[PDB]
Design an enzyme around this catalytic site. Structure first.
Site, mmCIF file in Angstrom:
data_model
loop_
_atom_site.group_PDB
_atom_site.id
_atom_site.type_symbol
_atom_site.label_atom_id
_atom_site.label_comp_id
_atom_site.label_asym_id
_atom_site.label_seq_id
_atom_site.Cartn_x
_atom_site.Cartn_y
_atom_site.Cartn_z
ATOM 1 N N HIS A 1 -8.857 2.114 4.952
ATOM 2 C CA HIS A 1 -8.388 3.540 4.967
ATOM 3 C C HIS A 1 -9.277 4.245 4.924
ATOM 4 O O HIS A 1 -9.593 5.327 5.764
ATOM 5 C CB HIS A 1 -7.393 3.887 3.976
ATOM 6 C CG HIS A 1 -5.955 2.845 4.468
ATOM 7 N ND1 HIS A 1 -5.167 2.710 5.985
ATOM 8 C CD2 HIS A 1 -5.140 2.119 3.640
ATOM 9 C CE1 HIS A 1 -4.300 1.779 5.610
ATOM 10 N NE2 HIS A 1 -4.067 1.545 4.196
ATOM 11 N N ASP B 1 -8.195 -3.536 -17.613
ATOM 12 C CA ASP B 1 -7.324 -4.789 -17.450
ATOM 13 C C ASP B 1 -8.494 -5.935 -17.185
ATOM 14 O O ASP B 1 -8.356 -7.053 -17.250
ATOM 15 C CB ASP B 1 -6.546 -4.905 -16.122
ATOM 16 C CG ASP B 1 -5.173 -4.072 -16.316
ATOM 17 O OD1 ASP B 1 -4.915 -3.902 -17.576
ATOM 18 O OD2 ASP B 1 -4.516 -3.739 -15.281
ATOM 19 N N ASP C 1 4.525 -2.463 -10.046
ATOM 20 C CA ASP C 1 4.874 -3.324 -8.602
ATOM 21 C C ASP C 1 5.144 -1.878 -7.625
ATOM 22 O O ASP C 1 4.504 -0.646 -8.037
ATOM 23 C CB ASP C 1 5.950 -4.063 -8.641
ATOM 24 C CG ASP C 1 5.651 -5.379 -9.582
ATOM 25 O OD1 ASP C 1 4.567 -5.726 -9.644
ATOM 26 O OD2 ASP C 1 6.456 -5.859 -10.206
ATOM 27 N N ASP D 1 -19.026 10.147 -1.080
ATOM 28 C CA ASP D 1 -17.968 10.056 -0.317
ATOM 29 C C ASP D 1 -16.765 9.596 -0.776
ATOM 30 O O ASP D 1 -15.679 10.168 -0.331
ATOM 31 C CB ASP D 1 -18.573 9.263 0.897
ATOM 32 C CG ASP D 1 -19.754 9.844 1.633
ATOM 33 O OD1 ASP D 1 -19.872 11.089 1.790
ATOM 34 O OD2 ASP D 1 -20.518 9.202 1.822
ATOM 35 N N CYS E 1 0.861 -1.393 0.154
ATOM 36 C CA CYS E 1 -0.150 -0.027 0.164
ATOM 37 C C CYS E 1 0.981 1.239 -0.101
ATOM 38 O O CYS E 1 1.918 1.166 0.738
ATOM 39 C CB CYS E 1 -0.928 0.077 1.355
ATOM 40 S SG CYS E 1 -2.065 1.359 1.421
ATOM 41 N N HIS F 1 -2.870 1.055 9.247
ATOM 42 C CA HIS F 1 -2.004 -0.274 8.860
ATOM 43 C C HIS F 1 -1.952 -1.119 10.144
ATOM 44 O O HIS F 1 -1.859 -0.304 11.368
ATOM 45 C CB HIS F 1 -0.714 0.164 8.497
ATOM 46 C CG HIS F 1 -0.574 0.409 6.962
ATOM 47 N ND1 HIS F 1 0.372 1.162 6.235
ATOM 48 C CD2 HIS F 1 -1.513 0.080 5.956
ATOM 49 C CE1 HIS F 1 -0.245 1.194 5.050
ATOM 50 N NE2 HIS F 1 -1.261 0.733 4.817
ATOM 51 N N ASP G 1 -3.378 14.264 -7.406
ATOM 52 C CA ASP G 1 -3.230 14.444 -5.975
ATOM 53 C C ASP G 1 -2.034 14.504 -5.413
ATOM 54 O O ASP G 1 -1.829 14.843 -4.350
ATOM 55 C CB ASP G 1 -4.254 13.288 -5.311
ATOM 56 C CG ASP G 1 -3.503 11.858 -5.404
ATOM 57 O OD1 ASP G 1 -2.321 11.916 -5.740
ATOM 58 O OD2 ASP G 1 -4.084 10.715 -5.166
ATOM 59 N N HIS H 1 -1.306 11.676 -10.983
ATOM 60 C CA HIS H 1 -2.828 11.495 -11.277
ATOM 61 C C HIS H 1 -3.709 12.344 -10.627
ATOM 62 O O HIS H 1 -4.945 12.166 -10.360
ATOM 63 C CB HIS H 1 -3.046 9.819 -10.923
ATOM 64 C CG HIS H 1 -2.812 9.488 -9.659
ATOM 65 N ND1 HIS H 1 -1.808 9.112 -8.963
ATOM 66 C CD2 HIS H 1 -3.722 9.478 -8.428
ATOM 67 C CE1 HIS H 1 -1.673 8.676 -8.034
ATOM 68 N NE2 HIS H 1 -2.956 8.990 -7.628
ATOM 69 N N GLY I 1 -14.321 15.802 0.096
ATOM 70 C CA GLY I 1 -13.329 15.827 -1.014
ATOM 71 C C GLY I 1 -12.554 14.633 -1.367
ATOM 72 O O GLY I 1 -13.096 13.423 -0.955
ATOM 73 N N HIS J 1 -8.467 -3.566 1.552
ATOM 74 C CA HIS J 1 -7.389 -3.047 2.215
ATOM 75 C C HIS J 1 -7.609 -1.333 2.107
ATOM 76 O O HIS J 1 -7.791 -0.694 3.300
ATOM 77 C CB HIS J 1 -6.048 -3.619 1.801
ATOM 78 C CG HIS J 1 -4.919 -2.559 2.511
ATOM 79 N ND1 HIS J 1 -4.182 -3.282 3.515
ATOM 80 C CD2 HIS J 1 -4.491 -1.387 2.345
ATOM 81 C CE1 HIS J 1 -3.445 -2.493 3.986
ATOM 82 N NE2 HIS J 1 -3.655 -1.198 3.340
ATOM 83 N N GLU J 2 -7.764 -0.962 1.043
ATOM 84 C CA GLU J 2 -7.952 0.671 0.757
ATOM 85 C C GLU J 2 -9.059 1.039 1.599
ATOM 86 O O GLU J 2 -9.083 2.353 1.809
ATOM 87 C CB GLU J 2 -7.643 0.970 -0.412
ATOM 88 C CG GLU J 2 -6.360 0.403 -1.308
ATOM 89 C CD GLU J 2 -5.003 1.200 -0.473
ATOM 90 O OE1 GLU J 2 -5.265 2.177 0.119
ATOM 91 O OE2 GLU J 2 -4.084 0.687 -0.719
HETATM 92 C C1 VOO Z 1 -1.528 8.852 -0.300
HETATM 93 N N1 VOO Z 1 -2.191 9.027 1.024
HETATM 94 C C2 VOO Z 1 -1.739 9.353 2.289
HETATM 95 C C3 VOO Z 1 -0.740 10.085 2.427
HETATM 96 C C4 VOO Z 1 -0.410 10.786 3.675
HETATM 97 F F1 VOO Z 1 0.728 11.652 3.712
HETATM 98 C C5 VOO Z 1 -1.004 10.332 4.996
HETATM 99 C C6 VOO Z 1 -2.118 9.299 4.598
HETATM 100 C C7 VOO Z 1 -3.018 8.744 5.658
HETATM 101 C C8 VOO Z 1 -3.839 7.933 5.119
HETATM 102 C C9 VOO Z 1 -4.917 7.125 5.677
HETATM 103 O O1 VOO Z 1 -5.961 7.259 5.123
HETATM 104 N N2 VOO Z 1 -4.925 6.451 6.851
HETATM 105 C C10 VOO Z 1 -6.298 5.927 7.117
HETATM 106 C C11 VOO Z 1 -6.510 6.726 8.683
HETATM 107 C C12 VOO Z 1 -5.262 6.687 9.196
HETATM 108 C C13 VOO Z 1 -5.471 7.041 11.009
HETATM 109 C C14 VOO Z 1 -4.497 7.092 11.563
HETATM 110 C C15 VOO Z 1 -3.118 6.834 11.197
HETATM 111 C C16 VOO Z 1 -2.018 6.892 12.088
HETATM 112 O O2 VOO Z 1 -2.181 6.825 13.368
HETATM 113 N N3 VOO Z 1 -0.679 6.964 11.492
HETATM 114 C C17 VOO Z 1 0.561 7.171 12.655
HETATM 115 C C18 VOO Z 1 1.140 5.853 12.892
HETATM 116 N N4 VOO Z 1 0.164 4.905 13.737
HETATM 117 C C19 VOO Z 1 0.832 3.549 13.715
HETATM 118 C C20 VOO Z 1 0.293 2.915 14.635
HETATM 119 C C21 VOO Z 1 -0.140 3.846 15.951
HETATM 120 C C22 VOO Z 1 0.236 5.095 15.193
HETATM 121 C C23 VOO Z 1 -3.015 6.300 9.703
HETATM 122 C C24 VOO Z 1 -4.114 6.318 8.972
HETATM 123 C C25 VOO Z 1 -3.828 5.980 7.505
HETATM 124 N N5 VOO Z 1 -3.679 8.150 3.564
HETATM 125 C C26 VOO Z 1 -2.564 8.859 3.345
HETATM 126 CA CA CA Z 2 -3.144 -1.700 -15.327
HETATM 127 CA CA CA Z 3 -14.428 11.620 -0.927
HETATM 128 CA CA CA Z 4 3.087 0.695 -8.552
HETATM 129 ZN ZN ZN Z 5 -2.580 0.781 3.345
HETATM 130 ZN ZN ZN Z 6 -4.113 9.045 -5.616
#
Ligand code: VOO
Ligand code: CA
Ligand code: CA
Ligand code: CA
Ligand code: ZN
Ligand code: ZN
Length: 229
Positions: A190, A91, A145, A125, A62, A196, A137, A135, A157, A186-187
């Site tokens: 999030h 695909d 891979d 949502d 991920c 994770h 963001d 792409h 958003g 998995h995604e």
């Molecule tokens: C490209 N996507 C992206 C870029 C970025 F810089 C940060 C994030 C965070 C997510 C995310 O949606 N989630 C889902 C919600 C959530 C909620 C909390 C935590 C978190 O606590 N992270 C800190 C480390 N963590 C590890 C165990 C206890 C603390 C992480 C997450 C991960 N996606 C991201």
């Molecule tokens: Ca493809």
């Molecule tokens: Ca949204």
């Molecule tokens: Ca890739």
């Molecule tokens: Zn993930």
């Molecule tokens: Zn993206």
């Protein structure tokens, strides 16, 4: 290509391990970052760039970081979550893609007070998008891979949206390619506000693991329980 040393440095950096070791005064050398990584992925905690750690770093995973600015408290504040399949990978057939995402949502629907309903509208949502490299963001994919997909925690958003790297061969994980069902499940984790997991057998474990068995682990179900009353 990258040296083992360089692949390691990029991985520790990209998934947030380098930053955490900096905050503890120990960025001079890789040892401390490696221990955080070994802990976070449940590898033996040697603090060495060893075979299990290099194996781990070469494993497709991920693109969401493991350690650490969004708006709100990162959970949904309404029962009926909507998703819009903005575009398609070539695909797979569109019905198989639609069904892979339906099945990923039925997995979580059974263990959350949330429902998931497909719409055709910009204001869904959870907006599902296939893309490559940059792409729209500024979290660009990396070609074939490595990173398979990412997602954003609940909120407005881009928040709650899920993106899939179309430089991957998307399949149902049988024969060639990555299971779109397993990566989406998995995604979407999030997209519901899960981080994770460290439990290797968990869906929310960051590394791709193909399975034909039911993908939720106690840890995934419990993570959702510790989020939604
Ligand atoms: C490209 N996507 C992206 C870029 C970025 F810089 C940060 C994030 C965070 C997510 C995310 O949606 N989630 C889902 C919600 C959530 C909620 C909390 C935590 C978190 O606590 N992270 C800190 C480390 N963590 C590890 C165990 C206890 C603390 C992480 C997450 C991960 N996606 C991201
Ligand atoms: Ca493809
Ligand atoms: Ca949204
Ligand atoms: Ca890739
Ligand atoms: Zn993930
Ligand atoms: Zn993206």
């Amino acid at each position: 290509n990258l040296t083992d040393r360089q692949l390691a440095e990029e991985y520790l950096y990209r998934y947030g391990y380098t930053r955490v070791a900096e905050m503890r005064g120990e960025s001079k050398s890789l040892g401390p970052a490696l221990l955080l990584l070994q802990k976070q992925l449940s590898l033996p905690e040697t603090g060495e760039l060893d075979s299990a750690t290099l194996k781990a770093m070469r494993t497709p995973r991920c693109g969401v970081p493991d350690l650490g600015t969004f708006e709100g408290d990162l959970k949904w504040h309404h029962h009926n979550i909507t998703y819009w399949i903005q575009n398609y990978s070539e695909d797979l057939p569109r019905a198989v893609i639609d069904d892979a995402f339906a099945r990923a949502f039925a997995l979580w629907s059974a263990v959350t007070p949330l429902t998931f309903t497909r719409v055709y509208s910009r204001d869904a949502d959870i907006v599902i998008q296939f893309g490559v490299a940059e792409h729209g963001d500024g979290y660009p994919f990396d070609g074939k891979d490595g990173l398979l997909a990412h997602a954003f925690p609940p909120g407005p958003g881009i928040q709650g949206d899920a993106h899939f790297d179309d430089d991957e061969l998307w399949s149902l994980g049988k024969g060639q390619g990555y299971s779109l069902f397993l990566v989406a499940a998995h995604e979407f984790g999030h997209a519901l506000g899960l981080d994770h997991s460290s439990v290797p057998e968990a869906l929310m474990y960051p590394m791709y693991r193909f399975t034909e068995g039911p993908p939720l682990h106690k840890d995934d179900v419990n993570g959702i329980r510790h989020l939604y009353g």
